[PDB]
């Protein structure tokens, strides 16, 4: 029943907690049924210990789902993102948000015309060349 493991961690300069994602394996399998002297990865201290969430891109251990929406920080797959914020700081796994809803007003005899303007300056960086070498 082999699978694959990925380590989701924030910056080590900031925190020291990690979340392990078992990709391609449902939660009910070995991920929550690990046994001593039975599995290849030596580290097993995480175990089940609650905070077990099922995702279409595998089962991840160490984060708790929150029914909110923020910009994607660390991509996971199938529309799930994780970050390191408050609920005393833990690791959450929310659903990616496309943006804020905005209903437009339409009428058959209405129009909108601006009265002022604004000047803005934006930047753009483009590579042009690479280093030369010889062997």
């Amino acid at each position: 029943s082999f699978g694959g493991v990925s380590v989701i961690t924030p910056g080590t300069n900031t925190s020291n907690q990690v979340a392990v994602l078992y990709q391609g394996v449902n939660c009910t399998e070995v991920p929550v049924a690990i046994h001593a002297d039975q599995l290849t990865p030596t580290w097993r201290v995480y175990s089940t210990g609650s905070n077990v969430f099922q995702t279409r891109a595998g089962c991840l251990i160490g984060a708790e789902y929150v029914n909110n929406s923020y910009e994607c920080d660390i991509p996971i797959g199938a529309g799930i993102c994780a970050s390191y914020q408050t609920q005393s700081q833990s690791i959450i796994a929310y659903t990616m948000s496309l943006g804020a809803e905005n209903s437009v007003a339409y009428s058959n005899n209405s129009i909108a015309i601006p009265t002022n303007f604004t000047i803005s300056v934006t930047t753009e960086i483009l590579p042009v060349s690479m280093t030369k070498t010889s062997v």
């Binding site: 082999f2 991509p75 199938a78 496309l98 943006g99 809803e101 437009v104 339409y106 129009i111």
Partner: protein, 322 residues
Amino acid sequence: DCTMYICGDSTECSNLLLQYGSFCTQLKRALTGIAVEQDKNTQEVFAQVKQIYKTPPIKYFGGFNFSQILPDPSKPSKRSPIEDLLFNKVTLLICAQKFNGLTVLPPLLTDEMIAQYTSALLAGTITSGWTFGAGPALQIPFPMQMAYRFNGIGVTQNVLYENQKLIANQFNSAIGKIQDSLSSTPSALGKLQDVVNHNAQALNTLVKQLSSKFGAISSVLNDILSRLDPPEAEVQIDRLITGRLQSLQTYVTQQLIRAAEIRASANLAATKMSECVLGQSKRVDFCGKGYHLMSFPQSAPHGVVFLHVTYVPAQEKNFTTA
């Protein structure tokens, strides 16, 4: 996964593989880079709007019927009939056999979010015109916008106002043949099928390549250990590791070229979406044949479909000029 593909979950095979250095840290980086590039490609094309606009409940745009492109709330997903027809024309034991170390990762953006993005673009381009490509959406009646667009191709705006009903009927009749022209001809969506066919065939060939002797006793590790003692069985198996590494190199080598080929088309699609949709184009034969007026995007599996509305002169008449 190198270890399982090259070595049949053995131990001495892994010990011999360890002597080849970083011939797999290099192989495990290119694929991750390709995956990140693929994730960025779809985001660069569709994520061009700050907010998610929604159409007003009332839908009467002066005679133009946009029901064929607007989302359908009756269906479980917010997909237009054209989008469903496109989605039902691309088909994606072997899939459950690839336990040799070859997997497939799911895309970051779900199709139900690409549909939301497409709906937002459609609402913005049907309610505000091209004014929402610079700042916020600005109100304008649809006939006024169409008169504005006719004014950009050298035709006086009075032509639309004096022929509004006929133009609306022509547009409604023209948009009513795309569904038939797609449901009848099966080769229209032929470009998108190759993208998955090549990726399936490459994996199939890579899996089939595992049953090669490579100038050795046999292609089965257990069979070659059960017949020869270590001192020269170690030499014999080395041919298998060399051959499997050489075979695995070509796969990523071809994938690196295919990634660039796909990226070029993704950039072209992004440019088309930014120019033909969010505005009006003067470039000849860029947003269709004739004089470009408007465009609407639709979502397809691993691709995008554009609908170009153009202006084509009808029957002529010669004269005498000075």
